[PDB]
Amino acid sequence: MAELNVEIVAVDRNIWSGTAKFLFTRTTVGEIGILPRHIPLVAQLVDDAMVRVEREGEKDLRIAVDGGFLSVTEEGVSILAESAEFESEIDEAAAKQDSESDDPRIAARGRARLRAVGAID
């Protein structure tokens, strides 16, 4: 039971920065879950959006990053994404445009976005 400060930086500006319980992202190593009180580490994303929760089995910050740098630190995790997006940009509208797969990043992120939106199953 502990809160870990997290921050997500975009290409033109910042997305969100505060405190969260844990998050589930994907890097070169694959799916990774950052839990409270954990050693720091760096890893590059795979353009598969970003899923972070500010609480255990409750909060669910819907984020969609594309090819960024993940830096987990106790001082306040940092995620420099090239094209991040808030949960507000997770509506079926965006899920459709991206679903079309009109790009390499949009395609991979498209499937990742749909899943987070509750597409699968």
CB within 8 Å of 109: residues ≥ 6 apart: 47, 48, 49, 64, 66, 98
User: Residue 110 belongs to what H/E stretch?
Assistant: helix 104-117
- Integer Cα distance of 4 and 14 in angstroms: 18
Cβ distance 20 to 6 under 8 Å?
yes
CB within 8 Å of 121: residues ≥ 6 apart: none
Total domain count, the chain: 1
The β-bridge partners of 112 are none
Q: For residue 96, count other CB atoms closer than 10 A to its CB.
A: 11
Q: How was this structure determined?
A: NMR
| Secondary structure (3-state) at 74 | coil
CB within 8 Å of 74: residues ≥ 6 apart: 4, 5, 37, 40
- Integer Cα distance of 121 and 108 in angstroms: 18
CA Rg, the chain, in Å?
Answer: 14
Phi, psi of 75 (to 5 degrees): -65, -25
Vertex 51: Cα angle to 50 and 54 (nearest 5) = 130
Tell me which residue range forms the domain holding 63.
Answer: 4-117
- Integer Cα distance of 114 and 46 in angstroms: 16
